[PDB]
């Protein structure tokens, strides 16, 4: 009665705001979501985002480029916020990622009631299980969907252990 | 050695920014920090913050009221960032808390080298230990004290 969703976001954060570039979400059932916001300003991107994140984004004709309102709607459907399953959000650390995701609904008060107010942290789980040796980091390091997938992979390894 | 800090914040957030009202930090050794920012704008507070948060704040002439720079400097001292301690940060449902804390320094890349880039989620630990029974308002130092209390019970 509970579905885990593994997510990662890319963004531009300056100490004041967090402007969403992209989000990838993978459910443990094989479903995938990925989108790139049409509303972030590429000029604001720092040097590191300009070289590592932006070049990996889809061509501007791609239907993966969506408005923020559209991404919100897409996520309400993808997370099945009106279905009977409870939702568990998982990310490597949450924090900035959780806020970026949740800001798609505006303030904290506006988040759909079934969306958890916290993200479970894979990093904490990994450490809780004695820091198992893990597979190496994939090649497309800063693509949000590739990242999310890899997080589901690691979650399965960490939890499918003998313990 | 490793030192755990438990913290909580109050703020005004509007889906874009997080304007820090106050922060409370408690170390495992018993040390406590609390401050209220002289830089948030109470006019911008929603009705919920107006009624539950602001009236719990100290009177205006209390030296608990500090600038954002003073709070940053206060925290670098309280967390002992110049020492050889390793630091763990812990909060309960703390995604926005972690951002609020980090924004005291700027982007997260401005964080001092020894402060961790993530805050451990006390609610995840709780559920991982089988959701043991925890005891029984929106004052950040009282909240932070209470997280340590719960941590000690969860790990007892
Ligand atoms: N029921 C609520 N309505 C509006 N904002 C809230 C609510 N609960 C928590 N918050 C926000 O999250 C911050 C942290 O809350 P707390 O640590 O629960 O005292 C508050 O300063 C509020 O801005
Ligand atoms: Mg990320
Ligand atoms: Mg709190």
UniProtKB/Swiss-Prot annotation, chain A:
What does this gene product do?
Exonuclease that cleaves single-stranded 3' overhangs of double-stranded RNA. Has no activity with 5' overhangs. Has negligible endonuclease activity. Can bind ATP, dATP and AMP (in vitro); the nucleotide occupies the predicted substrate binding site.
Keywords of the record, alphabetical order, are: Exonuclease, Hydrolase, Magnesium, Metal-binding, Nuclease
Q: What is its EC number?
A: 3.1.13.-
Instruction: Describe cofactor binding as the record notes it.
Output: Binds 1 Mg(2+) ion per subunit.
User: What Gene3D superfamilies does this protein map onto?
Assistant: Ribonuclease H-like superfamily/Ribonuclease H
Answer yes or no on keyword Transcription regulation.
no
Q: Does the keyword Iron-sulfur apply?
A: no
Q: Note the InterPro entries from the entry.
A: 3_5_Exoribonuc_actinobac (IPR030853), RNaseH-like_sf (IPR012337), RNaseH_sf (IPR036397), Rv2179c-like (IPR033390)
This protein's cofactor list reads: Mg(2+)
Q: Know the name of this protein?
A: 3'-5' exoribonuclease Rv2179c
Molecular function (GO) terms for this protein are: 3'-5' exonuclease activity; identical protein binding; magnesium ion binding; nucleic acid binding; RNA exonuclease activity
Q: So where does Mg(2+) get bound?
A: 8
Write the lineage as a comma-separated list: Bacteria, Bacillati, Actinomycetota, Actinomycetes, Mycobacteriales
Q: How does it assemble?
A: Homodimer.
Q: What is the effect of changing residue 147 to A?
A: Strongly reduces enzyme activity
User: What EC class is this?
Assistant: hydrolase
Q: How is its activity regulated?
A: Inhibited by EDTA.
> Where does the record place the region RNA binding?
8-11
Query: Note on file?
Result: Member of the DEDD group of RNAses that are characterized by the presence of four acidic residues in the active site. These residues are conserved even when the proteins have highly divergent sequences. Has high structural similarity to RNase T despite very low sequence identity.
């Amino acid at each position: 009665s509970m579905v885990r969703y593994f997510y990662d976001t890319e963004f531009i954060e300056d100490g004041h705001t967090i402007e969403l570039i992209s989000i990838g979400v993978v459910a443990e059932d094989g479903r995938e979501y990925y989108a790139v916001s049409t509303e972030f300003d590429p000029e604001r991107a720092g040097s590191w985002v300009r070289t590592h994140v932006l070049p990996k984004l889809p061509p501007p004709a791609s239907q993966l480029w969506r408005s923020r309102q559209q991404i919100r709607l897409d996520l309400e459907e993808f997370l099945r916020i009106d279905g009977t399953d409870s939702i568990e959000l998982w990310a490597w650390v949450g924090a900035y990622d959780h806020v970026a995701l949740c800001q798609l609904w505006g303030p904290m008060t506006a988040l759909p009631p079934t969306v958890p107010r916290f993200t479970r942290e894979l990093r904490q789980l990994w450490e809780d299980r004695g820091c198992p040796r893990m597979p190496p980091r994939p090649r497309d390091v800063h693509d949000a969907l590739v990242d999310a997938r890899d997080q589901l992979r690691r979650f399965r390894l960490i939890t499918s252990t003998d313990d």
